[PDB]
Design a protein around this ligand. Structure first.
Ligand SMILES: [Cl-]
Ligand SMILES: [Cl-]
Ligand SMILES: [Cl-]
Ligand SMILES: [Cl-]
Ligand SMILES: [Cl-]
Ligand SMILES: [Cl-]
Ligand SMILES: [Cl-]
Ligand SMILES: [Cl-]
Lengths: 268, 274, 274, 268
């Protein structure tokens, strides 16, 4: 079972993150993590060590512990980076995060959904959106406001998820249940939807199981603005939950065995 | 032992079975209580009896502290509603916690938010309403809206409110163990639910949970669902109530413990004296 | 979902109830199988009927994949023995794993270790023996020993053997998740048990588990217990067998999975082809 | 719930141990841990950092992570040291570990049981026993043997445990069940007993619950000798299980609240 723990005080010598149950063969580097941490600072000099579980840039199958030199989101974002690598390398699964509403201003829903290829443009946007018209209105609104007190709605999309991850049983063990819980557990979040949700299309989860479509998770939040950073942190938690459920369903001891189990299932 | 439960049964086998472990000795519970809560899951506006046995864990009308197994005669929601009736009796007797469920929107037709929140004393009236709301005005539009539609295909929004929850249940740690996270999970795990809010979230007020923990105010949980010939939404609210109760029972039991309703009651009384 | 089980019932209430979740569809199981396994828990040398319902999870004699609830008519060991009968049928049908239980010592009187180990084909003979051993010589001394004693106060050592377990079940990681650790826990959690060995441990042979994992040999688990007018030891062996089976079912299900006995069987067949 | 994880490769830059759910107020230092690690080397230059969860020599209530600079038992022994501090400071509970048989030679059971005050004498004994007659026979036997292949039986005693920790319910959640599992999960162990066990007085656990007596746990093992080190490692795991169960039964958020909950229960 993929399991993780974080540690470290706002003003201490280090933050520690530890993840267990990841298979051997995942390519992960400290520069990957430094890069993932920089992204958390974005919105209108991190040092990382991989202490255990890695040799020659690959996971070994043992527990991976990360030391980050410095409330904090760093350690969760670091874990999300490891989860990101694993999901892509083992399954072709990739996520995207963006802000779809901030301070009451909505983005245009008729516009194309962002994709993983839009990552550079989203990092470049001060409020993490491709909707250039909404962005300038959001910026105006931020400037009329203190900044970190404004609310918003964020969205995380997951591509390449194969159908069949989750359970048909009605319980918190369903995939939409686990995701809803992962988001709402983030400070400031007050709501979560799968797809159109309250507006109701399914958002890629139907009857507790992924259906093969894009998974669209939205989180409402209400506590220099904090909304873009929240989208990034939420992406980390969505990645971790997705990694956990995908590994439970197709898990092998090495990334190569894991793909091999995906191709088997997918060929029947 | 954490409060833990399980259900079983096929929609056309002889019986449905529900089991719950971790409940303290001394909860006052009867088959009658359950037959009653089961009746309510059938209410709902349309346009076109239950037998219960307490197989284990109860003696002389009171829980023993051991696992309680319930046989309900015969997807099903009965075993969960039954379970919520047991949680209801525990919450009220040990903590004076009571919940209420109502439909705040159905098929696009919203109710009026200004109207005062329903309270537990409004139960009989809520059961009497075909669409489970106190908004007479809205009830007629919703009925109109159902009539112009197949009924059970319409979705809506439900609300569950919890009165009397003391402050300090849940945790500051940002994780799954937060009370708001567990409730989101409890709702979202019910078939057809696509959304969940604490307070007026997507529009916002904390809804009684701040920083992962109950603050003493009324707790408000909303859920959006979208699936004779009746609508499914009022019943969804009754099921959501069942799961909110179970979660609240679990978390309250964890904080105030006790091997008996009396001891649990004393631990709360003690905690509130600081 | 991990194989998971729960029992309930009071020693003088209407029924005992046992429930097990996570079992694959297609296990062949009948009330009859259970009445039978329940009869065996009563065997034991002395000096001075069961009704079973499969309330859920079974249709046309086969498991459905959903939770299985069992009502046994009426401390008790019946619900665990019932549960072990279900695990027995699963183990044998999905993996060809079968177990045997026997008493290797009682009241200080040891059996002879040189004699060949009992096999599953020795069941009928083991049931026929008042002290559940194939050591005719020892059986008479034990009976002698019981006679010179209150019978149920005498302790002893029991052994459970598991044939056909494939290699690779459990883990290398030094923790609770090792197969030998889980079995130690399964036994030690039974009332009166004070000791547990894998193989000939205290005297030593691996007993089929090395480095936290099954190696393909026969698995051997020993347990030391010390509490008409019969001895309790032969029945303890039957209960220990029930818990060893459940643990083995859990761990095997975790490694070979499958939503059906057929699919699980194919995953093992696949694993053994490397 | 007291929860711990360990990480680190036999030949890597560090070993990491992390423990969560410990209350604020436990006095613990890196010198305590260095000392506990030295004890593991004993039998016929460790550097430790407390990365998180501690300030002014006291736990804060958050997760405690430990870095140890170097199969390994170091990280478990480190966790046992933290567990030791907590158990003594919160409950007056203290443990002892010793070898009661090695290579077939038995110690004298008529002799006084060791106590926590016997710690210096036990560390000083090359085979961890107060039975001086048995010790020289054990040493002879070791010398007649390769050394690390000899088996033995170890014992861990726990003093000051209050009656009532565990459960009467027949399951692996009983205290004797949890302890049996903690020992047997250690490599090389093949058997565990509570009290006289197979010999059968109760060894301090009756009907799944501690009874107020001394808890006596024995572990049979069969893989320069390794038996004394195994006794120390087993003590670490017994400490952790005891800490976990005691905290579940009387746990408060600070050591002071925890004692206070013990005195309450104990006064009724
Ligand atoms: Cl990407
Ligand atoms: Cl907004
Ligand atoms: Cl609606
Ligand atoms: Cl009471
Ligand atoms: Cl004996
Ligand atoms: Cl099948
Ligand atoms: Cl000490
Ligand atoms: Cl020995």
């Amino acid at each position: 079972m993929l399991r993780w723990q974080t540690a470290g005080e706002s003003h201490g010598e280090a933050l520690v993150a530890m993840i267990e149950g990841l298979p051997a063969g995942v390519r992960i580097s400290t520069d990957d993590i430094v890069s993932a941490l920089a992204r958390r600072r974005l919105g209108y000099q991190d040092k990382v060590r991989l202490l255990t579980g890695v040799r020659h840039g690959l996971t070994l199958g043992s527990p991976v512990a990360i030391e980050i030199a410095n409330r904090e989101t760093a350690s969760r974002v670091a874990l999300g980076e490891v989860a990101k690598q694993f999901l892509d390398q083992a399954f072709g699964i990739r996520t995207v995060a963006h802000v779809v509403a901030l301070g009451g201003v909505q983005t245009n829903p008729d516009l194309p959904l962002p994709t993983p290829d839009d990552l550079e443009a989203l990092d470049a946007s001060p409020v993490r959106t491709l909707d250039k018209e909404a962005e300038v209105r959001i910026i105006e609104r931020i400037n009329e406001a203190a900044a970190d007190t404004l609310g918003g709605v964020i969205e995380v999309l997951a591509y390449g998820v194969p159908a069949g991850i989750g359970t048909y049983v009605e319980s918190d063990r369903r995939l939409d249940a686990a995701l809803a819980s992962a988001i709402m557990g983030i400070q400031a979040f007050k709501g979560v939807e799968i797809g159109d949700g309250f507006l109701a299309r399914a958002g890629g989860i139907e009857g507790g199981m992924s259906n093969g479509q894009v998974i669209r998770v939205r989180g409402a939040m209400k506590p220099s603005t904090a909304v873009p950073a929240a989208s990034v942190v939420a992406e980390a938690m969505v990645r971790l939950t997705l990694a956990k459920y995908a590994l439970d369903k197709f898990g092998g001891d090495s990334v190569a065995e894991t793909r091999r189990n995906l191709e088997s299932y997918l060929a029947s």
